[PDB]
Amino acid sequence: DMYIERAGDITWEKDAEVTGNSPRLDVALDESGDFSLVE
Amino acid sequence: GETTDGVYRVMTRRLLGSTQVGVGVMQEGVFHTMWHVTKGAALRSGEGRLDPYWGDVKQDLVSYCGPWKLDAAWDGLSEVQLLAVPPGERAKNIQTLPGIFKTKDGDIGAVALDYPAGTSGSPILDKCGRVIGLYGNGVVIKNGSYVSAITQGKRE
Ligand SMILES: Cc1cc(OCC(N)=O)c2cccc(C)c2n1
């Protein structure tokens, strides 16, 4: 049995840590809702 | 229960200890998360019970107590923030520029941030603060790193 616990507000925090890249990928979506890399 | 707008952890005791299986958004009385987090199961909040109202395995989405409420979308241009809620660790904004999932049906935002599975369901925000979808369904790339779609539902 699962339960929820409040973790914070939904706010944009100015001068948040900025990182990660921006890749363009070709992907398939199956009937199970799994993404997979089309190459 | 707690019906207050904001972000939540999704916990189970069914394993060892209290294990965080995911994250979700409460908005307008409705809880939004990813199907693979709950598998459609009901949720406890105080004594309060939360029962599923809508879901789709293929979108990998599920709402509790009412229809899907989050309609805002990534504009294709601006930076966003992952409001990342990892297990045992405090909610924390990461700013990032989304890449693209290119699919035979269309193009979706992709956020390339690497975080545990229990983070699945953390919300993605535009500059106005609105949720433009949820982090935690996607793909492992050449590097061994993880990239998530921006997953958004429809609002009737
Ligand atoms: C947040 C998240 C979610 C995942 O799988 C769940 C899904 N459906 O995408 C992951 C799978 C492998 C590795 C990592 C780092 C993952 N991170």
- Is residue B36 part of the annotated active site? The answer reads yes
Q: What is the CATH number of the domain that holds B124?
A: 2.40.10.10
Residues B99 and B142 in one domain: yes
Question: Would you say residue B118 lies in a domain?
Answer: yes
Q: Which atom of ligand 1 is nearest to the CA of B135?
A: 1
Q: What angle do CA A25, B33, B13 make, to 5 degrees?
A: 120
Interchain pair B35, A33: CB under 8 A: yes
Residues B52 and B89 in one domain: no
Is-contact B18 A1, C-beta < 8 A? no
Residues B42 and B92 in one domain: no
Residues B59 and B102 in one domain: no
Radius of gyration of chain B (CA): 15
Q: What is the CATH number of the domain that holds B27?
A: 2.40.10.120
Given B64, B94, B109, the domain boundary residue is B64
Ligand 1: which residue has its CA nearest to atom 8?
B137
Is-contact B81 B74, C-beta < 8 A? no
Residues of A in contact with B103 (CB under 8 A): 26-29
Number of domains in chain B: 2
Catalytic residue among B5, B18, B32, B36: B36
Residues B134 and B101 in one domain: yes
Question: Would you say residue B13 lies in a domain?
Answer: yes
Q: Best residue in B19, B30, B58 to probe A by mutation, most A CBs within 10 Å?
A: B58
Residues B48 and B105 in one domain: no
Residues B101 and B143 in one domain: yes
Catalytic residue among B32, B63, B120, B148: B120
Contacts for A15 with CB less than 8 Å, ≥ 6 apart: none
- Is residue B71 part of the annotated active site? The answer reads no
Give the number of other CB atoms < 10 A from CB of residue B133.
25
Q: What is the Cα–Cα distance from B7 to A5, expressed in whole angstroms?
A: 9
How many residues belong to chain B?
A: 156
Q: What is the Cα–Cα distance from B156 to B144, expressed in whole angstroms?
A: 39
What Å resolution does this PDB entry report?
2.0
Question: Would you say residue B154 lies in a domain?
Answer: no
Interchain pair A4, B24: CB under 8 A: yes
- B86-112 in b/e form (b: 16+ CB < 10 A) is bbeeebbbbbbebbbbebeeeebbbbb
Among candidate residues B70, B50, B148, B54, the one with its CA nearest the CA of residue A5: B50
The experimental method, as deposited, was X-ray
Question: Would you say residue B138 lies in a domain?
Answer: yes
Interchain pair B43, A2: CB under 8 A: yes
- Domain span at residue B34? 6-64
